[PDB]
Structure formats: structure tokens, C-alpha cells
Amino acid sequence: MNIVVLISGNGSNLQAIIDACKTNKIKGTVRAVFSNKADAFGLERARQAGIATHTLIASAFDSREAYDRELIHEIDMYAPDVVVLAGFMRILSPAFVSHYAGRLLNIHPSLLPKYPGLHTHRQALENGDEEHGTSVHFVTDELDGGPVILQAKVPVFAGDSEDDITARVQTQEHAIYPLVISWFADGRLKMHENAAWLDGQRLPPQGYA
Ligand SMILES: Nc1nc(=O)c2cc(CNc3ccc(C(=O)N[C@@H](CCC(=O)O)C(=O)O)cc3)cnc2[nH]1
Ligand SMILES: NCC(=O)N[C@@H]1O[C@H](COP(=O)([O-])[O-])[C@@H](O)[C@H]1O
């Protein structure tokens, strides 16, 4: 099974996917890593692991719809079974999402539906929430609002800075994202429009395993 992952930055979630694949905890392999950022450190992590690297700068493209068609064109050389967003900072257009319908996955750092945009850790901190988290979901047109597959909650404390909530949440991501990609790789996980289905069971809105 061919996985390609899209990144915009450090690549710590990418690294976890590579390591799980390597130890066959995921029955499948990362064929290519795409970045929209030429300085993304995740590309050096891909490179050291011997995966194909591709940077595709949108300055160059004149239109959203246009950038996304070159990106579809290049991804499909690797013939992906699943494409996974892991830190990719761009809204994907209806066409992209329509093309990878059912096999497009993302990790969002909030307990969805709660903070469906950017700055979610700072929102948790400023609203004085007890509990923060992370959510793995199927990507849909609706920004950060496709069916949730698995969340992991985290405590937010008191003398807690954004960096502390951030690193605590990232720890959970590194454990639950390889795990839902292996349920996908084993044929367990499916979307049947707007619903996520694990082992034939329609999952509830907040996910769960
Ligand atoms: N269609 C779609 N659905 C999704 O649920 C989705 C999930 C993530 C959502 N992640 C993010 C990450 C960064 C930005 C971001 O930088 N947004 C700015 C810049 C414009 C752009 O994203 O292309 C903005 O104006 O919101 C947006 C969403 C990636 N694209 C998706 N695209
Ligand atoms: N909705 C998009 C988004 O903000 N995603 C977040 O980007 C980070 C990338 O980490 P990494 O570069 O170390 O993998 C991840 O922590 C992920 O939750």
C-alpha cells in the first residue's frame, strides 16, 4: 500500500509514519513526501529515509485551482492508496478533495468540533479549558469539518505555555495517526459519505476506536 504525505514544516508526524511503516506496524510504505515550503525540515527527514521529495511553490501558479491540478498530477505518479495531510498549511480545493475522496486524511490539533481553524492551542489556553486534544479525520470540502475517526484528549494545566500544550498534544498525534493509517491500510476503515466506518460499524461523531 502506497502512502504519500503532504507537509509544510517540521515533519515529526511524518517521522512517526515512516517509523511505523519501517517496523511494519503499518502494512504499507511512504512513496513520496510533498511540501509547499522549500525550507520544510520534513523534506530532510524524508530524504534521510530514502523517500522521494517534491517541493511545489504556489507563487509560481497564478490560481488555486491551478496549483492543485499540478499537485494532483505529481502525486498520482506514485499511485497513492491513501494521501495524508500531516501539517499541510493550505486549503485544498473541491477538485483535489473530490479526487482523493475517501482516501484523504488529516490531523487537526483540537477536540473537534471545537476549534476548527488555526491557533487552536492559543484558543484552548485563552478559554481556560481543562482538557485539550487532537483529532484525526477524513478531509471533506468543509474546512476541518470532515467525519472524525479518533481523538486523543490532553490536560491543559495552569502555568502552561502554548509550547507546553503544543508538545503534549504532539505526543498523542505521534501515537494515534500511525494507528488510524494502519486501520485504513488493513481495510478496516472506510468513509461512506460523511460517515466514518470502523469494522462495519458507523462511528459516533467524536470518533472512538
Ligand atoms: N478542503 C479542505 N478541507 C480540510 O478540512 C482541510 C484540512 C486542512 C486544514 N488546514 C489548514 C491549514 C492552514 C490553512 C491556512 O494557512 N489558511 C490560510 C491561507 C490560505 C490557504 O490555506 O491556502 C487561510 O486564509 O485560512 C488552512 C487550513 C488542510 N486543508 C484542508 N482542505
Ligand atoms: N489543520 C492543520 C494543522 O495545524 N496541523 C498541525 O500541524 C502540526 C505539524 O507538526 P509536524 O510538522 O511536527 O508534523 C501538527 O502538530 C498538526 O496537528
GROMACS .gro file of C-alpha atoms and ligand atoms in nm:
model
  259
    1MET     CA    1   0.000   0.000   0.000
    2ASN     CA    2   0.129   0.340  -0.117
    3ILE     CA    3   0.101   0.632   0.110
    4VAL     CA    4   0.204   0.987   0.013
    5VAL     CA    5   0.227   1.260   0.277
    6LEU     CA    6   0.197   1.631   0.238
    7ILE     CA    7   0.384   1.858   0.479
    8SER     CA    8   0.454   2.231   0.526
    9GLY     CA    9   0.710   2.216   0.808
   10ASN     CA   10   0.896   2.016   1.078
   11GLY     CA   11   0.783   1.665   0.992
   12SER     CA   12   0.752   1.499   1.333
   13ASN     CA   13   0.417   1.329   1.241
   14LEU     CA   14   0.575   1.221   0.904
   15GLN     CA   15   0.864   1.070   1.101
   16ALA     CA   16   0.625   0.860   1.309
   17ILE     CA   17   0.452   0.732   0.993
   18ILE     CA   18   0.795   0.640   0.843
   19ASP     CA   19   0.900   0.453   1.158
   20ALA     CA   20   0.575   0.258   1.184
   21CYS     CA   21   0.598   0.159   0.817
   22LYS     CA   22   0.957   0.052   0.876
   23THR     CA   23   0.858  -0.176   1.162
   24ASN     CA   24   0.560  -0.299   0.979
   25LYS     CA   25   0.318  -0.168   1.232
   26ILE     CA   26   0.167  -0.006   0.913
   27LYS     CA   27   0.145  -0.283   0.631
   28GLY     CA   28   0.245  -0.027   0.372
   29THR     CA   29   0.512   0.235   0.278
   30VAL     CA   30   0.565   0.612   0.220
   31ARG     CA   31   0.642   0.658  -0.152
   32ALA     CA   32   0.673   1.037  -0.170
   33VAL     CA   33   0.667   1.348   0.057
   34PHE     CA   34   0.532   1.673  -0.093
   35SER     CA   35   0.598   2.021   0.058
   36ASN     CA   36   0.475   2.371  -0.038
   37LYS     CA   37   0.762   2.518   0.157
   38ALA     CA   38   1.116   2.484   0.034
   39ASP     CA   39   1.264   2.507   0.377
   40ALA     CA   40   1.044   2.235   0.539
   41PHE     CA   41   1.259   2.020   0.767
   42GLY     CA   42   1.031   1.720   0.698
   43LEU     CA   43   1.184   1.700   0.349
   44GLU     CA   44   1.525   1.634   0.511
   45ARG     CA   45   1.363   1.358   0.725
   46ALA     CA   46   1.216   1.202   0.401
   47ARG     CA   47   1.549   1.239   0.229
   48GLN     CA   48   1.749   1.071   0.505
   49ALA     CA   49   1.497   0.780   0.493
   50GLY     CA   50   1.535   0.749   0.120
   51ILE     CA   51   1.184   0.869   0.022
   52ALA     CA   52   1.120   1.088  -0.283
   53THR     CA   53   1.095   1.457  -0.214
   54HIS     CA   54   0.896   1.722  -0.402
   55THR     CA   55   0.857   2.096  -0.340
   56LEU     CA   56   0.581   2.273  -0.521
   57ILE     CA   57   0.579   2.653  -0.455
   58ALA     CA   58   0.243   2.825  -0.526
   59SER     CA   59   0.394   3.165  -0.605
   60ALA     CA   60   0.452   3.008  -0.944
   61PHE     CA   61   0.091   2.907  -1.017
   62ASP     CA   62  -0.141   3.217  -1.070
   63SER     CA   63  -0.454   3.025  -0.941
   64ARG     CA   64  -0.566   2.792  -0.658
   65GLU     CA   65  -0.734   2.552  -0.892
   66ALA     CA   66  -0.418   2.555  -1.099
   67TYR     CA   67  -0.176   2.474  -0.821
   68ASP     CA   68  -0.396   2.187  -0.715
   69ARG     CA   69  -0.403   2.034  -1.061
   70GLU     CA   70  -0.024   2.018  -1.083
   71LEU     CA   71  -0.018   1.870  -0.731
   72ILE     CA   72  -0.276   1.604  -0.834
   73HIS     CA   73  -0.062   1.536  -1.145
   74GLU     CA   74   0.257   1.473  -0.946
   75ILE     CA   75   0.101   1.276  -0.662
   76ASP     CA   76  -0.057   1.032  -0.895
   77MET     CA   77   0.284   0.928  -1.039
   78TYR     CA   78   0.327   0.746  -0.704
   79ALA     CA   79  -0.012   0.590  -0.732
   80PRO     CA   80  -0.126   0.661  -0.373
   81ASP     CA   81  -0.372   0.437  -0.191
   82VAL     CA   82  -0.412   0.699   0.076
   83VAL     CA   83  -0.279   1.057   0.079
   84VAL     CA   84  -0.214   1.200   0.418
   85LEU     CA   85  -0.201   1.559   0.529
   86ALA     CA   86   0.046   1.599   0.819
   87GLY     CA   87   0.100   1.968   0.886
   88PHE     CA   88  -0.003   2.091   0.539
   89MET     CA   89  -0.093   2.459   0.556
   90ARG     CA   90  -0.331   2.515   0.256
   91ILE     CA   91  -0.698   2.484   0.185
   92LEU     CA   92  -0.742   2.225  -0.084
   93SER     CA   93  -0.990   2.297  -0.348
   94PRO     CA   94  -1.307   2.099  -0.420
   95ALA     CA   95  -1.140   1.926  -0.707
   96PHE     CA   96  -0.848   1.796  -0.502
   97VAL     CA   97  -1.079   1.683  -0.227
   98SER     CA   98  -1.313   1.531  -0.485
   99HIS     CA   99  -1.026   1.344  -0.644
  100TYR     CA  100  -0.891   1.187  -0.333
  101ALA     CA  101  -1.241   1.136  -0.189
  102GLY     CA  102  -1.227   0.854   0.071
  103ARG     CA  103  -0.853   0.833   0.084
  104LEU     CA  104  -0.769   1.179   0.208
  105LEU     CA  105  -0.682   1.207   0.579
  106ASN     CA  106  -0.580   1.491   0.814
  107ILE     CA  107  -0.474   1.553   1.171
  108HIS     CA  108  -0.614   1.870   1.333
  109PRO     CA  109  -0.490   1.986   1.685
  110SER     CA  110  -0.822   2.036   1.867
  111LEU     CA  111  -1.110   1.827   2.003
  112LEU     CA  112  -1.338   1.871   1.706
  113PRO     CA  113  -1.577   2.030   1.657
  114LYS     CA  114  -1.424   2.269   1.900
  115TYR     CA  115  -1.150   2.481   1.743
  116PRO     CA  116  -1.175   2.417   1.368
  117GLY     CA  117  -0.917   2.670   1.237
  118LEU     CA  118  -0.568   2.793   1.316
  119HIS     CA  119  -0.432   2.895   1.659
  120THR     CA  120  -0.630   2.617   1.841
  121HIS     CA  121  -0.375   2.580   2.128
  122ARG     CA  122  -0.395   2.955   2.200
  123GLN     CA  123  -0.777   2.926   2.192
  124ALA     CA  124  -0.764   2.639   2.446
  125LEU     CA  125  -0.534   2.834   2.669
  126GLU     CA  126  -0.734   3.160   2.646
  127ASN     CA  127  -1.072   3.000   2.705
  128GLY     CA  128  -0.928   2.832   3.016
  129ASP     CA  129  -1.016   2.480   2.901
  130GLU     CA  130  -0.949   2.186   3.126
  131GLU     CA  131  -0.898   1.949   2.850
  132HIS     CA  132  -0.733   1.994   2.510
  133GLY     CA  133  -0.667   1.728   2.235
  134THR     CA  134  -0.612   1.624   1.881
  135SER     CA  135  -0.836   1.480   1.606
  136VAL     CA  136  -0.781   1.253   1.307
  137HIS     CA  137  -1.049   1.299   1.042
  138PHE     CA  138  -1.142   1.230   0.677
  139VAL     CA  139  -1.094   1.556   0.473
  140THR     CA  140  -1.406   1.699   0.312
  141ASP     CA  141  -1.487   2.033   0.138
  142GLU     CA  142  -1.591   2.179   0.474
  143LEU     CA  143  -1.271   2.315   0.637
  144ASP     CA  144  -1.165   2.100   0.929
  145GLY     CA  145  -1.514   1.950   0.935
  146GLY     CA  146  -1.500   1.603   0.773
  147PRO     CA  147  -1.601   1.285   0.984
  148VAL     CA  148  -1.380   1.234   1.291
  149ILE     CA  149  -1.208   0.899   1.334
  150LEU     CA  150  -1.008   0.929   1.651
  151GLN     CA  151  -0.936   1.192   1.912
  152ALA     CA  152  -0.688   1.187   2.199
  153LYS     CA  153  -0.761   1.436   2.490
  154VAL     CA  154  -0.484   1.602   2.690
  155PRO     CA  155  -0.493   1.810   3.018
  156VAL     CA  156  -0.423   2.177   3.000
  157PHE     CA  157  -0.291   2.296   3.334
  158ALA     CA  158  -0.216   2.642   3.479
  159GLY     CA  159   0.138   2.770   3.433
  160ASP     CA  160   0.108   2.617   3.091
  161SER     CA  161   0.250   2.797   2.793
  162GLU     CA  162   0.147   2.739   2.428
  163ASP     CA  163   0.462   2.533   2.387
  164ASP     CA  164   0.376   2.304   2.667
  165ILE     CA  165   0.015   2.240   2.536
  166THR     CA  166   0.171   2.201   2.188
  167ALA     CA  167   0.432   1.938   2.277
  168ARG     CA  168   0.185   1.747   2.495
  169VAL     CA  169  -0.065   1.730   2.203
  170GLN     CA  170   0.207   1.633   1.953
  171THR     CA  171   0.294   1.327   2.164
  172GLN     CA  172  -0.056   1.198   2.120
  173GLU     CA  173  -0.050   1.270   1.747
  174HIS     CA  174   0.255   1.054   1.708
  175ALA     CA  175   0.065   0.769   1.853
  176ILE     CA  176  -0.284   0.794   1.714
  177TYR     CA  177  -0.203   0.897   1.349
  178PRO     CA  178   0.007   0.576   1.261
  179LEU     CA  179  -0.265   0.383   1.426
  180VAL     CA  180  -0.554   0.511   1.209
  181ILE     CA  181  -0.340   0.484   0.891
  182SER     CA  182  -0.289   0.110   0.980
  183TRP     CA  183  -0.668   0.062   1.023
  184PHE     CA  184  -0.702   0.221   0.672
  185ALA     CA  185  -0.415   0.006   0.531
  186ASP     CA  186  -0.580  -0.313   0.669
  187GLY     CA  187  -0.915  -0.236   0.505
  188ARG     CA  188  -1.089  -0.177   0.835
  189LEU     CA  189  -1.156   0.195   0.795
  190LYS     CA  190  -1.387   0.343   0.532
  191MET     CA  191  -1.587   0.661   0.464
  192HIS     CA  192  -1.945   0.613   0.320
  193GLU     CA  193  -2.035   0.978   0.268
  194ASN     CA  194  -1.995   1.192   0.569
  195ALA     CA  195  -1.977   0.882   0.795
  196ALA     CA  196  -1.651   0.714   0.906
  197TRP     CA  197  -1.697   0.331   0.947
  198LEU     CA  198  -1.461   0.110   1.156
  199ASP     CA  199  -1.509  -0.267   1.118
  200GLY     CA  200  -1.852  -0.222   0.955
  201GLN     CA  201  -1.972  -0.011   1.247
  202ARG     CA  202  -2.075   0.352   1.175
  203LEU     CA  203  -1.855   0.557   1.419
  204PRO     CA  204  -2.004   0.830   1.653
  205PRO     CA  205  -1.921   1.199   1.591
  206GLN     CA  206  -1.630   1.226   1.826
  207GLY     CA  207  -1.479   0.915   1.675
  208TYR     CA  208  -1.356   0.642   1.902
  209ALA     CA  209  -1.186   0.328   1.831
  210LIG     N1  210  -1.074   2.135   0.187
  210LIG     C1  211  -1.002   2.108   0.291
  210LIG     N2  212  -1.062   2.059   0.396
  210LIG     C2  213  -0.996   2.042   0.508
  210LIG     O1  214  -1.063   2.001   0.603
  210LIG     C3  215  -0.858   2.078   0.513
  210LIG     C4  216  -0.780   2.041   0.629
  210LIG     C5  217  -0.652   2.120   0.642
  210LIG     C6  218  -0.692   2.248   0.712
  210LIG     N3  219  -0.562   2.306   0.743
  210LIG     C7  220  -0.538   2.437   0.731
  210LIG     C8  221  -0.405   2.476   0.744
  210LIG     C9  222  -0.364   2.601   0.703
  210LIG    C10  223  -0.455   2.689   0.649
  210LIG    C11  224  -0.410   2.821   0.612
  210LIG     O2  225  -0.293   2.860   0.606
  210LIG     N4  226  -0.508   2.902   0.576
  210LIG    C12  227  -0.495   3.044   0.537
  210LIG    C13  228  -0.422   3.059   0.396
  210LIG    C14  229  -0.488   3.016   0.261
  210LIG    C15  230  -0.470   2.868   0.228
  210LIG     O3  231  -0.488   2.781   0.329
  210LIG     O4  232  -0.449   2.829   0.114
  210LIG    C16  233  -0.640   3.099   0.534
  210LIG     O5  234  -0.677   3.202   0.476
  210LIG     O6  235  -0.729   3.028   0.610
  210LIG    C17  236  -0.589   2.650   0.637
  210LIG    C18  237  -0.631   2.525   0.677
  210LIG    C19  238  -0.578   2.141   0.509
  210LIG     N5  239  -0.673   2.171   0.400
  210LIG    C20  240  -0.798   2.130   0.401
  210LIG     N6  241  -0.871   2.145   0.293
  211LIG     N1  242  -0.505   2.185   1.050
  211LIG     C1  243  -0.357   2.187   1.025
  211LIG     C2  244  -0.256   2.186   1.143
  211LIG     O1  245  -0.241   2.288   1.211
  211LIG     N2  246  -0.193   2.071   1.176
  211LIG     C3  247  -0.091   2.053   1.285
  211LIG     O2  248   0.038   2.080   1.231
  211LIG     C4  249   0.139   2.019   1.312
  211LIG     C5  250   0.255   1.971   1.225
  211LIG     O3  251   0.354   1.905   1.305
  211LIG     P1  252   0.483   1.848   1.242
  211LIG     O4  253   0.534   1.932   1.142
  211LIG     O5  254   0.594   1.823   1.352
  211LIG     O6  255   0.427   1.712   1.185
  211LIG     C6  256   0.076   1.900   1.380
  211LIG     O7  257   0.100   1.912   1.521
  211LIG     C7  258  -0.071   1.909   1.334
  211LIG     O8  259  -0.165   1.885   1.437
   0.00000   0.00000   0.00000
